[model samples]
Target: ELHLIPPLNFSMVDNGIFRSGFPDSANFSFLQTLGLRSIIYLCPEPYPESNLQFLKSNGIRLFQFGIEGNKEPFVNIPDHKIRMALKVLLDEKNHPVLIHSKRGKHRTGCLVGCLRKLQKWCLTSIFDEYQRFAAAKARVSDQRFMEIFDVSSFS
Candidate 1:
């Protein structure tokens, strides 16, 4: 018998985008089924050798954004990096992209929140989805950033 374990908080973002926490070797088998073309890793940590090997074998490209997580000391979520990530997220060629941070709670949610904004999603709907994933650990800063996130320039 066999089973697949997706990374924590795993969910589909839109047609081709997916969201989750940092994946491990255990999740490798499950991840393989996504046929992912790209991975948007949002953190400043090293990508595990095993995971790298997995990507190499699967021919999945990686887009790493080295931003500090608030799970650590308070730090500014660089708008520049988020902008850079959106460039990839919006590109259909990067379809089947998987976005993730440490917990798939705050940073990932924030980025996805920005994606929703670009989709012209309203504040109530945006935060509703964000909070659904962030749950009790939601951050005011993240919501604020999403609320004022300027997607006009992105389009």
Candidate 2:
């Protein structure tokens, strides 16, 4: 089972806290102490000046996904963006990707839920997962997600 990192913040926007940035050396060390190996920073552009080189040098695999806007429906986020994230996730050479958003809810939840749906998971299962996330992280931000995905004009 993949251990998805729950959203750390409530939203991806700067919450006036310093934890939103990519994992730094200390964070990496913490992960190392916890026996974790990989992390996926699934946020939009203008990433923090993380010591990625240090992380890489330390043998920690880092993944990044561009989260365009912190809005619901994720409409502003183009299809290519999602594809990019999926590509990174699928191409990862390891397991238990720690996916996070500013809040570790909403956007993160949506992506995981949609991916499960694409895997041919039944609607009930999808909703169950969604609820699990909401209960564990927070409530779902986009109730109209099904309708949004139904508009297949988008690729």
Candidate 3:
């Protein structure tokens, strides 16, 4: 059966790629509907046992990039880690992929913003999208990172 709404915080980012906050027990039904081939976890923590088992049973591949979601000045956004994660996300074979973090805010937002850069989206559009999800707590550093992020390597 097809679902009209995605689970919880999940939203389609691009063709075959979805973004969302970490999925819990309650999100299983909606997640299964995606027929996801892979998941990119961007938090600096271990996966819950139940989620691990679920992925194992469903044959979904996991790519974890433990990027710490710190606040400004002290924020430690890992450019290398983002590059690696994007490599997995960009591969056609990894279609139906989901990239997620604890709240689907900062870390996920920054990554998606960089992805927008890769797609050649204008700064206004990218920041608008990032601010929309981040709401009142958007990070200026993240925007700065996206502004200067080099997409030439991916091109």
Candidate 4:
């Protein structure tokens, strides 16, 4: 059975894992195509009721990192919380997962960039992926954060 999946911002980050912007009602049909087992939401706000219901009905686990969407250059980007989120991501049981933020830019980019680092990706490639998503609104703070982010714990 071939079904044409609708377009969404979701992008595969690893085997059976994806990264995307916040999914709305319109994206649900597309989302189901991924067979997502879990979602890592990187925002401080509570999940929308509609989305919550959809996840519950679909049996998808949600892992919220609760990261504030502060663009300040010096704003703290809770490393510990990110580590915790990554731990959930690393578990094979969490495969077919999705990680998302409001626009799936800074916060999501930072986490995926760190994951790339853990996978031994080059700094240039890492920043390139971040910049690609961030586009016109790319932040130096995020780039700096990834530069100094320690993957030793995951290593």
User: Over the stretch 9-92, how does candidate 3's per-residue lDDT look in tens digits?
Assistant: 678999999998888877877788899999999997899999999899888999999997787778878899999988998898
Quote model 4's TM-score: 0.93
Clashing pairs in 2: 7-104, 9-102, 9-103, 10-103, 11-103, 43-67, 44-67
Give the runs in model 4 whose Cα sits over 4 Å from its true position: 1-8
Candidate 1 lDDT tens digits, 1-155? 29999999999999999999999888988999999999999989989899899989999999999888765336478898999999999999999999999889888998999999998888999999999999998888888889878887976
Instruction: Tell me the spans in candidate 1 whose CA falls farther than 4 Å from its real position.
Output: 71-73
Which residue pairs show collisions in model 4? none
- State every prediction's TM-score relative to the real structure: 0.95, 0.56, 0.93, 0.93
After TM-score superposition, the amount by which residue 13's alpha carbon in candidate 4 deviates from its true location, in angstroms, is: 1.0
Which tens-of-lDDT digit does each residue in 1-155 have in candidate 2? 33434223322211111122234444554444433245556676544555556455557566666665455434454455555545545543544345555555555566665555556667667667556546654443443462244323222
Per-residue lDDT of model 4, residues 8-94, tens digit only: 456888897798889887777788878989999999999999999989988899999898899666667898878998898889899
Location of the lowest summed lDDT over 10 successive residues in candidate 2: 10-19
Global CA lDDT computed for model 4: 0.87
- Candidate lDDT (C-alpha), each: 0.90, 0.49, 0.87, 0.87
- Model 2 vs. true fold: TM: 0.56
Best by TM-score: 1
Off by over 4 Å in 3: 1-8
